[model samples]
Target: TVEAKNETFAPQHPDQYLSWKATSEQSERVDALAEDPRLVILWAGYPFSRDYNKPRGHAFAVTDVRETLRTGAPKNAEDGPLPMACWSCKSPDVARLIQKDGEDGYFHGKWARGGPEIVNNLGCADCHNTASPEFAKGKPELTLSRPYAARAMEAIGKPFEKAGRFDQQSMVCGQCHVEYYFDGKNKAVKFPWDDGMKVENMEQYYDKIAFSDWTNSLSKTPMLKAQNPEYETWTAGIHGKNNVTCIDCHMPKVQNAEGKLYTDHKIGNPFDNFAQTCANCHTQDKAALQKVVAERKQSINDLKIKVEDQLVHAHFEAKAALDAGATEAEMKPIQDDIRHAQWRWDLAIASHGIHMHAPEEGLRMLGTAMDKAADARTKLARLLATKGITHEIQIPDISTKEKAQQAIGLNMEQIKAEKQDFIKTVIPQWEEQARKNGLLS
Candidate 1:
């Protein structure tokens, strides 16, 4: 087998396979852009503005990544902008391919390059030592298989192989759960942890390197998009400081019908079964435990609105200055604030952990975002005054995702049309070859 697709080993571990498969239902889709349309402007000129959906689970990893407009409607194998590095988190197929092709060869090419072979979503082999003698003993030992994450650990002064076994519980999940970026040359995935994992620590690293994921289409400034940073963000909380690992909550141990105790493979919301997860230590009732969560959620939610709405105005202000023939040099400082401001807001939410994992940090980041955005608009007011226009700047109707997309020059109908054709034509060819190779059942 090129790799252990879930089906290839499902019969041997029926229970885990079923619960893992059920993750499809657990990870119901949330249209992030529709939930907050201002993101279109925030992520303008980026693929995410086209279709930003909350990620589902292992079952949908390969399917959703392929279908998402973020990949673009590449007509052929070498046609699109994104490299195969995007698939690094999508499949264990990527792990196997990396061994065969070398890390650069695996991440170097277009997203379509691995179309046929990446049939399987992430599964057993992605995080387990299936070939170890422990496996023969029915003990599937955890393994850190991704090289980029290994390198990150090394940079952060905690090599994965050397980390204590207890810490390895979290380190394995950290392989993909942390923030990373593609370097300028080969697009090989890398984490910005040469400095540290905190929000400001990472921002400085990106700034010093002059790196960015993409240029904002509206603000016309280079911007950074944070990937999942649960591991890092969680570190700030008491749970992480006390060395509580991810599996402790997300993959809590459970006894099956046969009274066999094993780690649950669901890797889902800890609150779903409070007794097994949160209640292990929290002596509070569900209502009492969740009330604290509700309080944090609303507090952060209120601050984030000001941060996001103000940043939207900042982008428009920067765009208006450029439209009115302001020199790029004169507008450079304001654009910097806009870029930094939006990145703070993105980090506050994108990691999806700060609210529970690090509420204090989340609130602080949002406050800084608010302040930076206000600074940008303050600069914009002065710029507009210099141009003899003192009235408030005009912002287009961006109350909905559709209108926001229009304001950003996207023809979603055209984008979706091409994607549909790719689904019909290109996707079929990929599946056929995977079946031929026994990579698909």
Candidate 2:
């Protein structure tokens, strides 16, 4: 029912519905990574250990990006843990900036340096081709505007120009939602799919490159933080294999007050629209479908919890082994086990709805994660016995977030103080500069 300035039906604009407010305002009962003490322990020596929240809607992307401790509010251009590349997904203004700098220079800039110019949150220009003849004729023709996504498609042998409109609709999402990393040398974005998109495939690629995000403070193993691989994981599932585009489920057709049909753009949990979306093909009742989905998610979660327990124990045991003078040669194999085990576990869960989209693959990865963690503990026990410290190591109480942060040796008060200072001084300056330059509205 709604159309944009370009005369195409628009679902990307946010101001048309009151329901959209829920996306940015609704808070989950618990923040998964925040409430889970073991996650803090696992991500020790990383900014994630400081804070990590459950996924929210795109409406909150800009605010969440600015507020996240991961961004590390910088005092100047030279400060901060992130690069300008971090804004890639949060703003359409990034599309404008990239045209000027080229891909390499765009990413090479500091995170704080681009804050002023990246004023608008994600919008129409990020996904659809406004100038396309189809768009002018009222069809929403999509295109891949992000250079990183286009490059990634080329690497995977699926160039954007050759893809059909339905496929391009999905691939546009692949721009940000898929697994990617910044090239350490040039800061250009890269996807780890040269070998392939499978969990083990990416693992081998990273191994070949000697790439690790950080060393686990407890296990002392090189670790990888698998960001959301939603697009990649979905591509391996039944829906993707059957050519079900993302819009079919996440943005199903719904009628507005004027009795006109348009694709709903909330793009959230399918369960919320179980009947309209699922019943398109499913013969089962909505209740029955929901139950099946819930059961699968619970099963994966149960196994995930078990693997997490063993991982927490492994980290502490490895610490004990090191304290007891276990040689690097002796600990190397065990650390590798810990590394691969956590990696598999992360890959399975990091993609938000993998349990429903790829339940069998999800279970298989989690199963191997559990097995590897068990093996790590077994070797750790033997190593401890040889060190003549046969007793159980005293594990600290990390049942709560505070205790977990303390155990990981973070000074939260100091970190919060610095973040506040940056917000008060630096963010206002960036805002003023943008307005002065007519780059921001």
Candidate 3:
């Protein structure tokens, strides 16, 4: 029998301790990307260039991006990290504020203005209801359940809180940890279940949105970018198909005092709890599962490196196409290919636990991404023909982040300075105002 402490540990004034620890984790993630600046180039033309850091625990969600230069600290309304919609997944505060102030009002200001007001970490309220002590059925839960559980029952009804279907223990984490996107028009946080959680379906979702993470510098196309490893891609794999949820791998069972049972709430990689996740499910030895994970990871890595090269190549070649006078219409298809390639890459790696959770599907997704990269690069090669360049075109040297940003037409110096100003000037005012209003103390 295994169990985890559902109660939070409040060390050194638990409230402040949790906030500082959470902020520190987020800063570390931000600092790591600051060290690897090339991501700035990779995300050129995107606000991510302003400040793309890593994800930490729930508490830092509000402050992390606000403090960073990426989500611009606004001097005024025209500029900021992004819209109010950006905070949707970051904190319970956004949801709470919306509940109080009406959805549109909460979402009306720039991210920097609205950020300090949005101050709740993903805490107990995100999962279990303190008032009801259940997974707290909400409208969003109801919408997802009705269609999601069609597999379980007769009349297309899935119970909002089922012991087998809901897994209160695991579903708590899924509330924030799962991948999502806000469809601005729909005004809803959408999970792409329409295409059945496969790579092809999400591509459809982005296509429907006419979405692109950013337009390509090389291909010059409106692209569809995937921001996740994907529920469906994970589902397509052995664990997902076999029905292993993240909690299965990340927060398996452990027993506690009085022999009570609960899932470990110290949510993290299954590799950390392989003995519990793998050992509980498989008869195979630890070494075998580890070996499988290792080999699959290697495949993912090798494929990623190749795809990155293709992207680099396409960026340079697209510039060549424009130089040689290739029409915008001719270049559009190549842009689409770049979009697909990038989405494929994101889908594979973003699902960080893929190698353990769905080794085969992980390999398949990356392989498909590599293929798309090749396809995009190949188009760039042919597109070059219209510009009167019969020979192979030269790509910009993107060996460093700076080089990549320049290659992608980003004015790094200008953008970087603007961000610094936002942090120094605007952010402090927002914080003090929030404190006075009792949103933060």
* Tens-place lDDT digits, model 3, residues 101-149: 7666766656655655666554443443334323323211311211112
Each candidate structure's TM-score, on Cα atoms with residue i matched to residue i, is: 0.97, 0.92, 0.79
Go through the candidates in order and give the C-alpha RMSD of each one to the true structure.
1.4, 3.3, 5.9
Model 2: lDDT of residue 213: 83
* TM-score, cand. 1: 0.97
Selected candidate, larger TM-score, 1 vs 3: 1
Off by over 4 Å in 1: none
lDDT of each: 0.84, 0.80, 0.58
Tens-digit lDDT string for candidate 2 (1-441):
111121122353322233433455534533666567888888898888888888787667776778777888687787898888788888767777777777777777688888887876565667776657676555667777788789888888889989877788789888888888777765777889888899999999988988888999887988888888888888998988998878788878877777877767666777788777988889999889888888999899898889988999899999999988888899999988998899999998887688778888889999989889989999999999999877877779998888898898988888878888877787778889977986665
Error of 1 at 63 (Å): 1.1
Please report the candidate that would top TM-score against the real structure. Answer: 1
Number of clashes recorded per candidate:
0, 0, 11
